[PDB]
Symmetry: D2
Subunit: 381 residues, 4 copies
């Protein structure tokens, strides 16, 4: 009965020790510089604070219209003041080699714009969701990327969230069986007094109501969970005509879709009901419930069968995977380096916009809108 | 300190004691006698077994077309062999004073016929859902009910399930705020080898597919959870064309509704995916999640707000309320003894059938169907 | 495609059909007749109500000291008024061939007496736990059982509860790995105003405090979850000195054990805190959490590993196994009919009593008590 | 029906916007510099990466024995290489005004040492748990802090974890009622091959087994949950004599405690069973279950009562509170600035060590160890 060699071989005095075991993502290099456009809610609450956890990304320069603020932010994240661009001279970034790409976090209407401008600035483009307010504008963004021979990546963080990935994997391993019915719901009360929620009420900047903003989650979700595209869609929308919030954009809208596989889906988004992010995938062996489904934190999934409910969630002491944000940032830096295609290409953001427009059309005409245009997902969902 | 009077006064020898505290519904009488029509799957697995927990009901007679089976069930439940009736001599129950009501648990297309025959036989009628296969038939049952001056109740067990009533209660107390979105799903894999599912695949006997069989739960649930009736419905249905199960009845169907209050809903029923009974009611203050929502056992409900999930389910040592089956059985009994209306009258059953026809009609035409026809829930939801 | 033979062959008119699929335990016979001794809280809330789901048992006679109460319960359960016995003429059951066994549900201190009298009366015996108030008395019951060549079973409902048996099963399949720590807690607020709790505060009638009443669950549970017996016990007990409830029996007691395999355990019982029934079994591969663990209803179990929580509980539409109450009742019946031993023989009851005395002794002396006395669970845990 | 002023007043063109709403901790100043000693597992996996989220803390200098490593780390976190101290010249830090305090994250045996040395270096001391390997050594650490007129803060992160705080609050608001039984368990398999787990096996560096390392959580927990100190304690320990891991330190140990309030507790820690962090507090109105109880992430709490389970956890889109780590770091920086006493003073770390030694004694002698020495918690628990 004797103690292990390693143990007994430890200096009962101050001594140097080896690299400890990594039970969570350790910082590596920082060879990718980002140009963050629009210092808004998402940019300052979830994106910037998510760089610290990156393994290959850094905030090289900011791009804000507000000076007082922009300077303050630059301090908190320690960015060279001489590198605080704006909407006027955003193009000058092409004169800095330390700017590998830009991350546009502006209202949907301004997405396409600064993307193309950025592409000519010889930088990679990471644009937020939804890609743009126009199908065509999405296409122009792509073309620009190809002309400038650069990478185009939309901000689909759920494509890099551990639980969402585990969700796709269990479904690919056929744990639910033959897929037949998906149900999604994404909701949160619209606050008109919130600076970030105002341009969302404006059909010009937003490009749509809840669907364009959060219903896109269920739409996108339904797509990568099923692992295929809708071939047909129907939809109905409605908003309280007395509510000033939805004069231009829609509050609630419900869409039904069919897939070549034969599977059906029905989901909805809302601006008048509180926090809801719930996905449901039904197969003939089991049903998957993701609730939370697409949150920033605390996502939880469960596979249910009579008498059983197997749940998954981030461990309580370890982090076998990085958070969606950092993972997303380093996903571009990583696609550039090893010269690989991104999982969230502009081609993907475009597909969502078409389908959304197809939906709005269905809601407008009250007829089904054929969406069998032959889109193909590059690199699987 | 010393022992209280209660304990100090307990004899140490064998002695009679008081009535004990009741922590569950105790039996009381067996005044109300039923005649069960149709010894099938629901009857033998749920209803018959349900008479034990009743406080006022008993099984007096059986009505089957399978003598071999009747004698067996009859002996299993201590029913008098003389009280076995077949479908042709069914009407003679009018001669038995000890038969107060019948419980029709026959295929949907046969409900009307026996309800009517039972009324002419001068008996009260409990009839399973769907009420019937035609709106008109629901009316003939109601008319016949009014002619015999007897009561007509449709078997909506969920109207007597502790958790459902609790979900209704917290909603009416405005714990969710203004209601805006309601989602429902009800699915279970159809197995044509099961004797009970065989007539369910026959349009002539079933009246319809998954909506008629289990979608009705999401429908009815949506109505008593909101406490209002829909003014219009839209819907789409699809069934694999090569699946022999759905030659005559629909497999999956999706339907969405709008209510006079402005709230919306979207639900689905399915015969090709595994067990699913789930309701969510989004308010602008909180969200109610019922999952399981309409199970025979283990219903569970959750009120969710960012950071919280207050769950409710049956206690583990006490039974505050009787089970839905026993309650439903005693509800008719009590309403007859105290001369009161039933919470689930034929009018209610008829309203579901009418709505179901509108949904099919809407699925069929691919157009909206106005259902704003002035149905008024007598006695509340 | 076309409809399968099954469906296409369903008559459209009233017709007898097959026996239905069974999704829950169906009644079969009522061969085994019991005589219930002691119409108290457990008898009237759980056991009597439990005879309905039995497949082989029935209530033939009642034994009470409160005639007014006996006639009422007798009428409630269709028992023959002639079959009511008081405590003095109890022995005459020997004259009734239709009485196969007795179910003693009297205060703990009176179990031995009636078990013995019942055996001399030539009947089988079901006796509640604690088996008795003295080790010696457990033996006299066993000896008397052997003399009448009749069976003796202690009422350990948990030995017939689907979830408990499931927890045992996953453990024996090594899903937790080598077991090392087991925690148990069983608590419920003692209310001396309740007639049933009155004798529980009398050392002479109860035999002990919370350990004898509900701690026994953690104890017994610990034993069948590990599948082995403890070799030594240590314990401490404390009760507010000014609380009239605990003048003679203990309120809270904590006890820890060591098993021949090396595993340890620490549990507690309590009469002054609210409802608690929780077991955790830590292995080096996973952890089992039973909560509720020993409830009358809604037991729930969870196997936990970093990032997962696989839960199990009764299904919502099917009843794979009969409830613990009905099962326990039929277990004795079956064992008599098929000439087999019972899973819960007096030896098992006696082992708990012996262990309980060791725990009290250990609490009293503040010293360890060796319990390595060679008890062997016949038939497995 | 017209759109809100704020909305309509947004430039459909690139425009500067105001500071967005903060739905999570925003970075403020960075006026507090930390000196991190020992670049081990905890230091590089949970502490350093937690500085980024601070509001007033920064990593000014490192103190490692290993040079190659230390330099690498310094890069990742961007620290001035010229500021990479070591165990030889750790004292020179007194020559740098930008070092406001040191954070000792060395083996327990080396805690007291570098603390006092640090205090004479005119810096504040943040020492990890357990405070030290000697009661006396704890006292010397305090004295040094008072002599150098500095602040002494132990690393009790659970004192700064949102859920743990919510736990204390609900208990203070009397939601559980009168507290009477606490149950804790802290376990994780010991990996001898893990560089960080080796000195823990050495009684000289560790100062104890699981209790000193993780059982301290349940001990500490029991204390701040109850909000009072134990007046008496008993304990038993045991380890498989064949396991090489526990030749010196103990694997498992179970302790029972009593409080002046009259409340009782029983908890345990383990090195041979997998991940377990579960606290249970029983009152006469409700029971609180914390599971996870003290994890790095995903903590969850539930208040249970018959039929109900109200759960709390971090929201899925917002962060109303900072993580325990950052919160802990900024807690010192904040106590220094506004000149306020820390909630985790050396006086607190000392109390735990005494109690632990008192426990080990109880486990050693097998007798109860009186702990009524009159400790008083400064600033509440
Ligand atoms: N994937 C996800 O989870 C989420 C994605 N998003 C997306 O991020 C993008 C930004 O929206 P969000 O941060 O919420 O909103 P905000 O209103 O808070 O910020 C918009 C930012 O864009 C700039 N901007 C330029 N022109 C305008 C204009 N005319 N009106 C308003 N802002 C302007 C501003 O930068 P500055 O003031 O500094 O000059 C401002 O900070 C959207 O495309 C949104 O869909 C949002 C939330 C989550
Ligand atoms: N509320 C609820 O939760 C549920 C309600 N139900 C309802 O109960 C009713 C019966 O359905 P269910 O028990 O599942 O089905 P079953 O097929 O198992 O039984 C139907 C019964 O009615 C009698 N019957 C008479 N003529 C026919 C016929 N031509 N074809 C089939 N059966 C006939 C038979 O009884 P016998 O052999 O003795 O003559 C048969 O057992 C339906 O209206 C259904 O909607 C069903 C499930 C759940
Ligand atoms: N396995 C389980 O889950 C449970 C088992 N039990 C066990 O059941 C047995 C009865 O307890 P419980 O039903 O709770 O208690 P009760 O006090 O409610 O009833 C005891 C019954 O025994 C009879 N009795 C005869 N003499 C006495 C006496 N001197 N004092 C009190 N009662 C007397 C009475 O019946 P009558 O009036 O008709 O003469 C009385 O109703 C106990 O041994 C207990 O441990 C209890 C709860 C749960
Ligand atoms: N509150 C909490 O949640 C936790 C607190 N801790 C505490 O943190 C402290 C550090 O332990 P932990 O990080 O897990 O362990 P590690 O073994 O991984 O690291 C110990 C560090 O201390 C230094 N050190 C100096 N002398 C020695 C020595 N003789 N043997 C080993 N290391 C030495 C080393 O620094 P370098 O190699 O760089 O020279 C080494 O990096 C402990 O007091 C522990 O209790 C640990 C986990 C969680």
């Amino acid at each position: 009965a004797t103690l292990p060699a390693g143990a007994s071989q430890v200096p009962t005095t101050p001594a140097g020790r080896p690299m400890p075991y990594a039970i969570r993502p350790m910082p590596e290099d920082r060879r990718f510089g980002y140009a963050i456009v629009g210092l808004g809610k998402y940019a300052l609450n979830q994106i910037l604070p998510g760089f610290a956890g990156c393994q290959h990304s850094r905030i090289e320069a900011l791009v804000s219209g507000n000076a007082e603020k922009a300077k303050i932010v630059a301090a908190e994240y320690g960015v060279d003041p001489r590198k605080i661009y704006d909407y006027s001279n955003f193009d000058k970034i092409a004169k800095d080699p330390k700017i590998d790409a830009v991350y546009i976090i502006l209202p949907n209407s301004l997405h396409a714009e600064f993307a193309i401008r950025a592409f000519k600035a010889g930088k990679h483009v990471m644009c937020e969701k939804p890609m743009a307010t126009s199908v065509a504008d999405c296409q122009r963004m792509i073309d620009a990327a190809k002309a400038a021979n650069k990478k185009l990546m939309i901000g689909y963080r759920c494509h890099y969230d551990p639980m969402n990935r585990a969700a796709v994997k269990l479904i690919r391993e056929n744990q639910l069986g033959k897929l037949g019915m998906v149900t999604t719901d994404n909701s949160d009360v619209m606050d008109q007094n919130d600076p970030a929620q105002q341009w969302r009420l404006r059909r010009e900047l937003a490009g749509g109501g809840s669907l364009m903003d959060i219903g896109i989650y269920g739409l996108n979700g339904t797509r990568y969970l099923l692992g295929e595209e809708p071939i047909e869609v129907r939809a109905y929308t409605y908003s309280d005509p007395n509510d000033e919030r939805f004069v231009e954009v829609e509050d609630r809208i419900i869409w039904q879709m069919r897939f070549r596989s034969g599977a059906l889906s029905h989901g909805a988004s809302s601006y008048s009901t509180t926090t809801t992010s719930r996905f449901s995938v039904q197969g003939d062996k089991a049903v998957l419930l993701m609730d939370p489904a697409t949150g920033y934190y605390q996502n939880l999934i469960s596979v249910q069968t009579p008498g059983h409910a197997n749940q998954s969630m981030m461990p309580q002491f370890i982090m076998p995977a990085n958070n969606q944000f950092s993972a997303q940032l380093d996903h571009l830096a990583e696609a550039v380096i090893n010269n690989k295609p991104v999982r969230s290409p502009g081609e993907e953001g475009m597909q969502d916009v078409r389908l959304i427009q197809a939906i709005y059309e269905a809601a407008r005409t009250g007829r089904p809108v054929n969406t069998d245009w032959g889109y193909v997902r590059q690199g699987g969902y």
